[PDB]
């Protein structure tokens, strides 16, 4: 019941590799994440339990090495379901977005922000269920019911919210909302809107000026685009929140059997 074969390397991570491990008796599969910040990742993982969040099973100290034992997601990355310049069918996009909201609602409800939401970190199981992955940059933004503001910049530039480049301190939750928006834009367009949301960025100025007759917006369609108008608001205090994304017309539009 103990004893696991490493059966292939799933990918190269930035830190180690990730290995598929199968159980010699039960044939159960797990991903094994090898690290030669990591203590906090393990600590946060122990906190987490939800259907659209990669399951943490355990961890091995083994000398110097840290072995992380996580849900195997045989669907790979949502990134690989996005066709360059096309995106994916809108009903597929909408389902993925529902599940991503479920995962993000769950984290925010336990005071956790992930801070690096992007399709490379949205993994898919055998049934195309979406699992949020890699708490490597995640942190606690609410504890004993009291919010702490963030002031450390991290994430990935094309998905980062504007306030994170402009302000010394900023709320955690609107940043994760913004990045879900870029993830939506991608799924529906096959294309990232800007390299960063800086006023030194023409594509960002064009969006603030409302020129939706350009790409990527023009590929999109007025119901999902209207929702994107409420997510990608420069002022995070004015940005739509999750409870209200849930009231959105497109979000609630029937599309998929
Ligand atoms: O990369 C992470 O940090 C965790 N990675 C994973 N965790 C849990 N299950 C997984 O299934 C994969 C995977 C699945 C099918 C094909 C290829 C890879 C991957 C995968 C993906 C890219 C890089 C590294 C691994 C994966």
PDB file of C-alpha atoms and ligand atoms in Angstrom:
ATOM      1  CA  UNK A   1       0.000   0.000   0.000  1.00  0.00           C
ATOM      2  CA  UNK A   2       3.173   2.044   0.472  1.00  0.00           C
ATOM      3  CA  UNK A   3       5.764   2.325  -2.342  1.00  0.00           C
ATOM      4  CA  UNK A   4       5.376   4.588  -5.426  1.00  0.00           C
ATOM      5  CA  UNK A   5       7.008   4.386  -8.891  1.00  0.00           C
ATOM      6  CA  UNK A   6       8.053   7.640 -10.584  1.00  0.00           C
ATOM      7  CA  UNK A   7       6.629   6.926 -14.018  1.00  0.00           C
ATOM      8  CA  UNK A   8       7.276  10.138 -15.962  1.00  0.00           C
ATOM      9  CA  UNK A   9       8.242  13.750 -15.572  1.00  0.00           C
ATOM     10  CA  UNK A  10       5.147  15.877 -16.213  1.00  0.00           C
ATOM     11  CA  UNK A  11       7.149  19.086 -16.734  1.00  0.00           C
ATOM     12  CA  UNK A  12      10.076  21.283 -15.773  1.00  0.00           C
ATOM     13  CA  UNK A  13       8.768  23.701 -13.142  1.00  0.00           C
ATOM     14  CA  UNK A  14      11.238  26.510 -12.390  1.00  0.00           C
ATOM     15  CA  UNK A  15      12.560  25.031  -9.248  1.00  0.00           C
ATOM     16  CA  UNK A  16      12.480  21.342  -9.832  1.00  0.00           C
ATOM     17  CA  UNK A  17      10.575  18.927 -11.965  1.00  0.00           C
ATOM     18  CA  UNK A  18       7.099  17.547 -11.288  1.00  0.00           C
ATOM     19  CA  UNK A  19       6.784  13.772 -11.499  1.00  0.00           C
ATOM     20  CA  UNK A  20       3.808  11.475 -12.040  1.00  0.00           C
ATOM     21  CA  UNK A  21       3.943   8.858  -9.306  1.00  0.00           C
ATOM     22  CA  UNK A  22       1.777   5.669  -9.380  1.00  0.00           C
ATOM     23  CA  UNK A  23       1.082   3.318  -6.459  1.00  0.00           C
ATOM     24  CA  UNK A  24       2.455  -0.219  -7.021  1.00  0.00           C
ATOM     25  CA  UNK A  25      -0.629  -1.729  -5.251  1.00  0.00           C
ATOM     26  CA  UNK A  26      -3.584   0.565  -5.870  1.00  0.00           C
ATOM     27  CA  UNK A  27      -2.422   2.228  -9.090  1.00  0.00           C
ATOM     28  CA  UNK A  28      -3.445   5.643  -7.649  1.00  0.00           C
ATOM     29  CA  UNK A  29      -1.589   8.530  -9.345  1.00  0.00           C
ATOM     30  CA  UNK A  30      -0.032  11.605  -7.720  1.00  0.00           C
ATOM     31  CA  UNK A  31       2.117  14.482  -8.897  1.00  0.00           C
ATOM     32  CA  UNK A  32       5.322  14.978  -6.973  1.00  0.00           C
ATOM     33  CA  UNK A  33       6.769  18.470  -6.847  1.00  0.00           C
ATOM     34  CA  UNK A  34      10.530  18.573  -6.051  1.00  0.00           C
ATOM     35  CA  UNK A  35      12.220  21.595  -4.453  1.00  0.00           C
ATOM     36  CA  UNK A  36      15.976  21.947  -3.999  1.00  0.00           C
ATOM     37  CA  UNK A  37       8.444  30.433   0.784  1.00  0.00           C
ATOM     38  CA  UNK A  38       8.369  26.661   0.384  1.00  0.00           C
ATOM     39  CA  UNK A  39       7.439  26.309   4.080  1.00  0.00           C
ATOM     40  CA  UNK A  40       4.588  28.784   3.574  1.00  0.00           C
ATOM     41  CA  UNK A  41       3.399  26.941   0.422  1.00  0.00           C
ATOM     42  CA  UNK A  42       3.132  23.750   2.495  1.00  0.00           C
ATOM     43  CA  UNK A  43       1.444  25.578   5.361  1.00  0.00           C
ATOM     44  CA  UNK A  44      -1.105  27.237   3.077  1.00  0.00           C
ATOM     45  CA  UNK A  45      -1.741  23.926   1.244  1.00  0.00           C
ATOM     46  CA  UNK A  46      -2.598  22.207   4.557  1.00  0.00           C
ATOM     47  CA  UNK A  47      -5.312  24.845   5.007  1.00  0.00           C
ATOM     48  CA  UNK A  48      -7.038  24.126   1.669  1.00  0.00           C
ATOM     49  CA  UNK A  49      -9.901  21.820   0.781  1.00  0.00           C
ATOM     50  CA  UNK A  50     -12.080  22.363  -2.261  1.00  0.00           C
ATOM     51  CA  UNK A  51     -13.065  20.720  -5.562  1.00  0.00           C
ATOM     52  CA  UNK A  52     -11.501  23.444  -7.766  1.00  0.00           C
ATOM     53  CA  UNK A  53      -8.247  23.586  -5.798  1.00  0.00           C
ATOM     54  CA  UNK A  54      -5.411  21.077  -6.285  1.00  0.00           C
ATOM     55  CA  UNK A  55      -5.467  18.684  -3.332  1.00  0.00           C
ATOM     56  CA  UNK A  56      -2.465  18.502  -1.043  1.00  0.00           C
ATOM     57  CA  UNK A  57      -1.841  15.007   0.312  1.00  0.00           C
ATOM     58  CA  UNK A  58       1.530  15.407   2.127  1.00  0.00           C
ATOM     59  CA  UNK A  59       5.239  16.172   2.093  1.00  0.00           C
ATOM     60  CA  UNK A  60       8.622  14.491   2.569  1.00  0.00           C
ATOM     61  CA  UNK A  61      11.627  16.180   4.285  1.00  0.00           C
ATOM     62  CA  UNK A  62      14.194  13.664   2.869  1.00  0.00           C
ATOM     63  CA  UNK A  63      17.569  15.258   3.719  1.00  0.00           C
ATOM     64  CA  UNK A  64      17.784  18.569   1.840  1.00  0.00           C
ATOM     65  CA  UNK A  65      14.933  17.825  -0.690  1.00  0.00           C
ATOM     66  CA  UNK A  66      11.302  18.776  -0.245  1.00  0.00           C
ATOM     67  CA  UNK A  67       8.849  16.436  -1.923  1.00  0.00           C
ATOM     68  CA  UNK A  68       5.316  17.846  -2.310  1.00  0.00           C
ATOM     69  CA  UNK A  69       2.474  15.424  -2.911  1.00  0.00           C
ATOM     70  CA  UNK A  70      -0.406  16.954  -4.908  1.00  0.00           C
ATOM     71  CA  UNK A  71      -3.455  15.965  -7.002  1.00  0.00           C
ATOM     72  CA  UNK A  72      -2.536  14.614 -10.395  1.00  0.00           C
ATOM     73  CA  UNK A  73      -4.396  16.524 -13.055  1.00  0.00           C
ATOM     74  CA  UNK A  74      -4.345  14.517 -16.271  1.00  0.00           C
ATOM     75  CA  UNK A  75      -5.962  17.253 -18.341  1.00  0.00           C
ATOM     76  CA  UNK A  76      -2.824  19.392 -18.070  1.00  0.00           C
ATOM     77  CA  UNK A  77      -3.018  23.183 -18.160  1.00  0.00           C
ATOM     78  CA  UNK A  78      -5.921  25.322 -19.231  1.00  0.00           C
ATOM     79  CA  UNK A  79      -3.208  27.172 -21.246  1.00  0.00           C
ATOM     80  CA  UNK A  80      -3.147  24.265 -23.769  1.00  0.00           C
ATOM     81  CA  UNK A  81      -6.932  24.455 -24.390  1.00  0.00           C
ATOM     82  CA  UNK A  82      -6.554  28.021 -25.613  1.00  0.00           C
ATOM     83  CA  UNK A  83      -5.931  28.254 -29.370  1.00  0.00           C
ATOM     84  CA  UNK A  84      -3.600  31.134 -30.314  1.00  0.00           C
ATOM     85  CA  UNK A  85      -5.662  33.962 -31.759  1.00  0.00           C
ATOM     86  CA  UNK A  86      -8.976  31.946 -31.467  1.00  0.00           C
ATOM     87  CA  UNK A  87      -9.567  31.064 -27.881  1.00  0.00           C
ATOM     88  CA  UNK A  88     -12.100  28.293 -27.254  1.00  0.00           C
ATOM     89  CA  UNK A  89     -15.859  27.858 -27.632  1.00  0.00           C
ATOM     90  CA  UNK A  90     -17.731  30.289 -25.440  1.00  0.00           C
ATOM     91  CA  UNK A  91     -19.668  27.622 -23.501  1.00  0.00           C
ATOM     92  CA  UNK A  92     -16.353  25.963 -22.576  1.00  0.00           C
ATOM     93  CA  UNK A  93     -14.965  29.331 -21.472  1.00  0.00           C
ATOM     94  CA  UNK A  94     -18.011  30.014 -19.386  1.00  0.00           C
ATOM     95  CA  UNK A  95     -17.849  26.690 -17.577  1.00  0.00           C
ATOM     96  CA  UNK A  96     -14.149  27.173 -16.789  1.00  0.00           C
ATOM     97  CA  UNK A  97     -14.846  30.680 -15.505  1.00  0.00           C
ATOM     98  CA  UNK A  98     -17.706  29.383 -13.198  1.00  0.00           C
ATOM     99  CA  UNK A  99     -15.305  26.868 -11.698  1.00  0.00           C
ATOM    100  CA  UNK A 100     -12.541  29.459 -11.397  1.00  0.00           C
ATOM    101  CA  UNK A 101     -14.926  31.742  -9.512  1.00  0.00           C
ATOM    102  CA  UNK A 102     -15.803  28.791  -7.221  1.00  0.00           C
ATOM    103  CA  UNK A 103     -12.134  28.227  -6.479  1.00  0.00           C
ATOM    104  CA  UNK A 104     -11.375  31.926  -5.931  1.00  0.00           C
ATOM    105  CA  UNK A 105     -14.496  32.439  -3.736  1.00  0.00           C
ATOM    106  CA  UNK A 106     -13.262  29.529  -1.581  1.00  0.00           C
ATOM    107  CA  UNK A 107      -9.724  30.986  -1.095  1.00  0.00           C
ATOM    108  CA  UNK A 108     -10.918  34.469  -0.389  1.00  0.00           C
ATOM    109  CA  UNK A 109     -13.387  33.046   2.166  1.00  0.00           C
ATOM    110  CA  UNK A 110     -10.477  31.544   4.124  1.00  0.00           C
ATOM    111  CA  UNK A 111      -8.332  34.689   3.925  1.00  0.00           C
ATOM    112  CA  UNK A 112      -6.038  33.379   1.184  1.00  0.00           C
ATOM    113  CA  UNK A 113      -4.959  35.121  -1.976  1.00  0.00           C
ATOM    114  CA  UNK A 114      -3.178  33.101  -4.683  1.00  0.00           C
ATOM    115  CA  UNK A 115      -1.714  36.196  -6.444  1.00  0.00           C
ATOM    116  CA  UNK A 116      -0.697  34.411  -9.708  1.00  0.00           C
ATOM    117  CA  UNK A 117      -3.887  33.453 -11.475  1.00  0.00           C
ATOM    118  CA  UNK A 118      -3.143  32.572 -15.098  1.00  0.00           C
ATOM    119  CA  UNK A 119      -3.916  29.542 -17.439  1.00  0.00           C
ATOM    120  CA  UNK A 120      -0.485  27.971 -16.805  1.00  0.00           C
ATOM    121  CA  UNK A 121      -1.685  27.627 -13.140  1.00  0.00           C
ATOM    122  CA  UNK A 122      -5.158  26.341 -13.880  1.00  0.00           C
ATOM    123  CA  UNK A 123      -4.936  22.600 -14.272  1.00  0.00           C
ATOM    124  CA  UNK A 124      -7.618  20.267 -15.505  1.00  0.00           C
ATOM    125  CA  UNK A 125      -8.597  16.789 -14.237  1.00  0.00           C
ATOM    126  CA  UNK A 126      -9.775  13.741 -16.268  1.00  0.00           C
ATOM    127  CA  UNK A 127     -13.251  15.351 -16.648  1.00  0.00           C
ATOM    128  CA  UNK A 128     -12.004  18.863 -17.548  1.00  0.00           C
ATOM    129  CA  UNK A 129     -12.783  20.128 -13.997  1.00  0.00           C
ATOM    130  CA  UNK A 130     -10.626  23.237 -13.291  1.00  0.00           C
ATOM    131  CA  UNK A 131      -8.193  23.122 -10.317  1.00  0.00           C
ATOM    132  CA  UNK A 132      -6.268  26.116  -9.028  1.00  0.00           C
ATOM    133  CA  UNK A 133      -2.557  25.231  -8.654  1.00  0.00           C
ATOM    134  CA  UNK A 134       0.721  26.478  -7.164  1.00  0.00           C
ATOM    135  CA  UNK A 135       0.419  28.382  -3.914  1.00  0.00           C
ATOM    136  CA  UNK A 136       4.047  29.315  -4.247  1.00  0.00           C
ATOM    137  CA  UNK A 137       3.193  33.042  -4.222  1.00  0.00           C
ATOM    138  CA  UNK A 138       0.033  32.877  -2.177  1.00  0.00           C
ATOM    139  CA  UNK A 139      -0.387  34.741   1.076  1.00  0.00           C
ATOM    140  CA  UNK A 140      -2.792  35.454   3.961  1.00  0.00           C
ATOM    141  CA  UNK A 141      -4.788  38.629   3.484  1.00  0.00           C
ATOM    142  CA  UNK A 142      -7.326  38.086   6.253  1.00  0.00           C
ATOM    143  CA  UNK A 143      -6.687  36.727   9.721  1.00  0.00           C
ATOM    144  CA  UNK A 144      -9.056  36.824  12.801  1.00  0.00           C
ATOM    145  CA  UNK A 145     -11.367  38.709  10.566  1.00  0.00           C
ATOM    146  CA  UNK A 146      -9.176  41.644   9.964  1.00  0.00           C
ATOM    147  CA  UNK A 147      -7.824  42.500   6.537  1.00  0.00           C
ATOM    148  CA  UNK A 148      -4.227  43.281   5.858  1.00  0.00           C
ATOM    149  CA  UNK A 149      -3.294  45.190   2.720  1.00  0.00           C
ATOM    150  CA  UNK A 150      -0.598  43.877   0.452  1.00  0.00           C
ATOM    151  CA  UNK A 151       2.543  45.857  -0.583  1.00  0.00           C
ATOM    152  CA  UNK A 152       4.842  43.332  -2.195  1.00  0.00           C
ATOM    153  CA  UNK A 153       4.582  43.105  -5.920  1.00  0.00           C
ATOM    154  CA  UNK A 154       4.246  39.693  -7.411  1.00  0.00           C
ATOM    155  CA  UNK A 155       2.512  37.765 -10.075  1.00  0.00           C
ATOM    156  CA  UNK A 156       2.921  37.805 -13.846  1.00  0.00           C
ATOM    157  CA  UNK A 157       2.924  41.162 -15.696  1.00  0.00           C
ATOM    158  CA  UNK A 158       0.125  40.583 -18.359  1.00  0.00           C
ATOM    159  CA  UNK A 159      -2.249  39.384 -15.582  1.00  0.00           C
ATOM    160  CA  UNK A 160      -1.279  41.826 -12.794  1.00  0.00           C
ATOM    161  CA  UNK A 161      -3.786  44.611 -11.830  1.00  0.00           C
ATOM    162  CA  UNK A 162      -2.805  48.250 -12.313  1.00  0.00           C
ATOM    163  CA  UNK A 163      -2.887  49.262  -8.677  1.00  0.00           C
ATOM    164  CA  UNK A 164      -0.127  46.724  -8.018  1.00  0.00           C
ATOM    165  CA  UNK A 165       2.246  48.686 -10.220  1.00  0.00           C
ATOM    166  CA  UNK A 166       1.006  52.169  -9.010  1.00  0.00           C
ATOM    167  CA  UNK A 167       0.317  52.013  -5.262  1.00  0.00           C
ATOM    168  CA  UNK A 168       2.415  51.256  -2.233  1.00  0.00           C
ATOM    169  CA  UNK A 169      -0.401  49.153  -0.672  1.00  0.00           C
ATOM    170  CA  UNK A 170      -3.578  47.677  -2.258  1.00  0.00           C
ATOM    171  CA  UNK A 171      -6.381  45.218  -1.456  1.00  0.00           C
ATOM    172  CA  UNK A 172      -5.805  41.519  -2.247  1.00  0.00           C
ATOM    173  CA  UNK A 173      -9.177  40.565  -3.614  1.00  0.00           C
ATOM    174  CA  UNK A 174      -9.575  43.033  -6.528  1.00  0.00           C
ATOM    175  CA  UNK A 175      -6.122  41.924  -7.874  1.00  0.00           C
ATOM    176  CA  UNK A 176      -7.296  38.319  -8.139  1.00  0.00           C
ATOM    177  CA  UNK A 177     -10.488  39.484  -9.745  1.00  0.00           C
ATOM    178  CA  UNK A 178      -8.512  41.456 -12.385  1.00  0.00           C
ATOM    179  CA  UNK A 179      -6.383  38.469 -13.242  1.00  0.00           C
ATOM    180  CA  UNK A 180      -9.458  36.268 -13.640  1.00  0.00           C
ATOM    181  CA  UNK A 181     -10.499  38.848 -16.156  1.00  0.00           C
ATOM    182  CA  UNK A 182      -7.377  38.589 -18.177  1.00  0.00           C
ATOM    183  CA  UNK A 183      -7.869  34.785 -18.025  1.00  0.00           C
ATOM    184  CA  UNK A 184     -11.389  35.231 -19.435  1.00  0.00           C
ATOM    185  CA  UNK A 185     -10.099  37.571 -22.224  1.00  0.00           C
ATOM    186  CA  UNK A 186      -7.608  34.884 -23.145  1.00  0.00           C
ATOM    187  CA  UNK A 187     -10.077  32.003 -23.222  1.00  0.00           C
ATOM    188  CA  UNK A 188     -12.421  34.042 -25.469  1.00  0.00           C
ATOM    189  CA  UNK A 189      -9.776  35.647 -27.768  1.00  0.00           C
ATOM    190  CA  UNK A 190      -6.655  33.436 -27.727  1.00  0.00           C
ATOM    191  CA  UNK A 191      -4.727  36.550 -26.980  1.00  0.00           C
ATOM    192  CA  UNK A 192      -3.456  38.647 -24.009  1.00  0.00           C
ATOM    193  CA  UNK A 193      -4.552  42.313 -24.126  1.00  0.00           C
ATOM    194  CA  UNK A 194      -1.324  44.074 -23.032  1.00  0.00           C
ATOM    195  CA  UNK A 195       2.203  43.272 -21.779  1.00  0.00           C
ATOM    196  CA  UNK A 196       1.299  45.190 -18.635  1.00  0.00           C
ATOM    197  CA  UNK A 197      -1.447  47.594 -17.432  1.00  0.00           C
ATOM    198  CA  UNK A 198       0.745  50.676 -17.357  1.00  0.00           C
ATOM    199  CA  UNK A 199      -0.099  54.054 -18.773  1.00  0.00           C
ATOM    200  CA  UNK A 200       3.184  53.515 -20.838  1.00  0.00           C
ATOM    201  CA  UNK A 201       1.313  50.758 -22.647  1.00  0.00           C
ATOM    202  CA  UNK A 202      -0.609  51.669 -25.779  1.00  0.00           C
ATOM    203  CA  UNK A 203      -2.928  48.661 -25.660  1.00  0.00           C
ATOM    204  CA  UNK A 204      -3.885  49.538 -22.099  1.00  0.00           C
ATOM    205  CA  UNK A 205      -4.513  53.221 -23.023  1.00  0.00           C
ATOM    206  CA  UNK A 206      -6.656  52.053 -25.962  1.00  0.00           C
ATOM    207  CA  UNK A 207      -8.767  49.952 -23.627  1.00  0.00           C
ATOM    208  CA  UNK A 208      -9.153  52.855 -21.154  1.00  0.00           C
ATOM    209  CA  UNK A 209     -10.167  54.999 -24.118  1.00  0.00           C
ATOM    210  CA  UNK A 210     -12.820  52.285 -24.952  1.00  0.00           C
ATOM    211  CA  UNK A 211     -11.635  51.349 -28.458  1.00  0.00           C
ATOM    212  CA  UNK A 212     -13.223  47.883 -28.337  1.00  0.00           C
ATOM    213  CA  UNK A 213     -13.365  47.862 -32.180  1.00  0.00           C
ATOM    214  CA  UNK A 214      -9.669  46.641 -31.929  1.00  0.00           C
ATOM    215  CA  UNK A 215      -8.256  43.224 -30.979  1.00  0.00           C
ATOM    216  CA  UNK A 216      -8.599  41.392 -28.733  1.00  0.00           C
ATOM    217  CA  UNK A 217     -11.970  42.858 -27.825  1.00  0.00           C
ATOM    218  CA  UNK A 218     -13.393  42.713 -31.283  1.00  0.00           C
ATOM    219  CA  UNK A 219     -13.273  38.871 -31.262  1.00  0.00           C
ATOM    220  CA  UNK A 220     -15.347  38.800 -28.128  1.00  0.00           C
ATOM    221  CA  UNK A 221     -19.091  39.469 -28.105  1.00  0.00           C
ATOM    222  CA  UNK A 222     -21.059  41.908 -26.317  1.00  0.00           C
ATOM    223  CA  UNK A 223     -22.367  39.814 -23.395  1.00  0.00           C
ATOM    224  CA  UNK A 224     -18.877  38.524 -22.166  1.00  0.00           C
ATOM    225  CA  UNK A 225     -17.308  41.845 -23.173  1.00  0.00           C
ATOM    226  CA  UNK A 226     -19.711  43.775 -20.924  1.00  0.00           C
ATOM    227  CA  UNK A 227     -18.604  41.664 -18.021  1.00  0.00           C
ATOM    228  CA  UNK A 228     -14.990  42.356 -19.031  1.00  0.00           C
ATOM    229  CA  UNK A 229     -15.919  46.063 -18.879  1.00  0.00           C
ATOM    230  CA  UNK A 230     -16.775  45.645 -15.151  1.00  0.00           C
ATOM    231  CA  UNK A 231     -13.731  43.468 -14.279  1.00  0.00           C
ATOM    232  CA  UNK A 232     -11.010  45.456 -16.066  1.00  0.00           C
ATOM    233  CA  UNK A 233     -11.734  48.763 -14.256  1.00  0.00           C
ATOM    234  CA  UNK A 234      -8.554  50.664 -13.430  1.00  0.00           C
ATOM    235  CA  UNK A 235      -9.812  51.823 -10.027  1.00  0.00           C
ATOM    236  CA  UNK A 236      -9.935  48.726  -7.803  1.00  0.00           C
ATOM    237  CA  UNK A 237     -12.347  50.426  -5.450  1.00  0.00           C
ATOM    238  CA  UNK A 238     -14.758  50.716  -8.383  1.00  0.00           C
ATOM    239  CA  UNK A 239     -14.005  47.225  -9.800  1.00  0.00           C
ATOM    240  CA  UNK A 240     -16.839  44.621  -9.688  1.00  0.00           C
ATOM    241  CA  UNK A 241     -16.569  42.158  -6.865  1.00  0.00           C
ATOM    242  CA  UNK A 242     -17.232  38.462  -6.987  1.00  0.00           C
ATOM    243  CA  UNK A 243     -20.797  38.413  -5.510  1.00  0.00           C
ATOM    244  CA  UNK A 244     -21.676  40.784  -8.324  1.00  0.00           C
ATOM    245  CA  UNK A 245     -19.803  38.933 -11.102  1.00  0.00           C
ATOM    246  CA  UNK A 246     -22.241  36.191 -10.043  1.00  0.00           C
ATOM    247  CA  UNK A 247     -25.152  38.473 -10.887  1.00  0.00           C
ATOM    248  CA  UNK A 248     -23.734  39.307 -14.284  1.00  0.00           C
ATOM    249  CA  UNK A 249     -25.898  38.592 -17.337  1.00  0.00           C
ATOM    250  CA  UNK A 250     -23.373  36.617 -19.438  1.00  0.00           C
ATOM    251  CA  UNK A 251     -22.170  34.681 -16.345  1.00  0.00           C
ATOM    252  CA  UNK A 252     -25.767  33.514 -15.959  1.00  0.00           C
ATOM    253  CA  UNK A 253     -26.525  33.013 -19.766  1.00  0.00           C
ATOM    254  CA  UNK A 254     -27.327  29.335 -20.594  1.00  0.00           C
ATOM    255  CA  UNK A 255     -25.007  28.017 -23.252  1.00  0.00           C
ATOM    256  CA  UNK A 256     -23.780  24.465 -22.466  1.00  0.00           C
ATOM    257  CA  UNK A 257     -25.696  21.162 -22.068  1.00  0.00           C
TER     258      UNK A 257
HETATM  259  O1  LIG B   1       3.764  22.302 -12.378  1.00  0.00           O
HETATM  260  C1  LIG B   1       3.219  22.383 -11.168  1.00  0.00           C
HETATM  261  O2  LIG B   1       3.754  23.101 -10.296  1.00  0.00           O
HETATM  262  C2  LIG B   1       2.335  21.218 -10.760  1.00  0.00           C
HETATM  263  N1  LIG B   1       2.022  20.434 -11.983  1.00  0.00           N
HETATM  264  C3  LIG B   1       1.056  19.459 -12.044  1.00  0.00           C
HETATM  265  N2  LIG B   1       0.425  19.142 -10.885  1.00  0.00           N
HETATM  266  C4  LIG B   1      -0.537  18.208 -10.870  1.00  0.00           C
HETATM  267  N3  LIG B   1      -0.837  17.499 -11.965  1.00  0.00           N
HETATM  268  C5  LIG B   1      -0.253  17.791 -13.151  1.00  0.00           C
HETATM  269  O3  LIG B   1      -0.454  17.251 -14.423  1.00  0.00           O
HETATM  270  C6  LIG B   1       0.413  17.859 -15.305  1.00  0.00           C
HETATM  271  C7  LIG B   1       0.455  17.423 -16.754  1.00  0.00           C
HETATM  272  C8  LIG B   1      -0.631  16.677 -17.253  1.00  0.00           C
HETATM  273  C9  LIG B   1      -0.641  16.223 -18.564  1.00  0.00           C
HETATM  274  C10 LIG B   1       0.455  16.504 -19.415  1.00  0.00           C
HETATM  275  C11 LIG B   1       1.562  17.223 -18.931  1.00  0.00           C
HETATM  276  C12 LIG B   1       1.565  17.664 -17.600  1.00  0.00           C
HETATM  277  C13 LIG B   1       1.154  18.814 -14.564  1.00  0.00           C
HETATM  278  C14 LIG B   1       2.239  19.749 -15.066  1.00  0.00           C
HETATM  279  C15 LIG B   1       2.044  20.548 -16.195  1.00  0.00           C
HETATM  280  C16 LIG B   1       3.067  21.400 -16.667  1.00  0.00           C
HETATM  281  C17 LIG B   1       4.289  21.483 -15.989  1.00  0.00           C
HETATM  282  C18 LIG B   1       4.504  20.673 -14.856  1.00  0.00           C
HETATM  283  C19 LIG B   1       3.477  19.821 -14.397  1.00  0.00           C
HETATM  284  C20 LIG B   1       0.715  18.776 -13.237  1.00  0.00           C
END
